Amino acid sequence: MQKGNFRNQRKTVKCFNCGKEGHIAKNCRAPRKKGCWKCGKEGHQMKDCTERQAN
Ligand SMILES: [Zn+2]
Ligand SMILES: [Zn+2]
Structure with missing residues (x-):
């Protein structure tokens, strides 16, 4: 898999959205x-x- 996820997904790290x-x-x-x-x-x-230029 791509270099990013290794341990399932959840756990560790921190949510910078909720904190x-x-x-x-x-x-x-x-x-x-x-x-x-x-x-x-x-x-x-x-x-x-x-949208590109409002239009
Ligand atoms: Zn969150
Ligand atoms: Zn938009």
């Missing part, structure tokens, strides 16, 4: 905000932003 040691933000089962600050779409992100 709970054991999991990561990417493994945060409790999302929030993460609202496109480009279009304002409080759901999708730039990686999922089909």
Whole structure:
């Protein structure tokens, strides 16, 4: 597998989203905000932003 996950997933590390040691933000089962600050779409992100120049 890719260089990143080795011990299942959970455990160790720390969640920089909630601040709970054991999991990561990417493994945060409790999302929030993460609202496109480009279009304002409080759901999708730039990686999922089909918008380029507003249009
Ligand atoms: Zn979390
Ligand atoms: Zn967007």
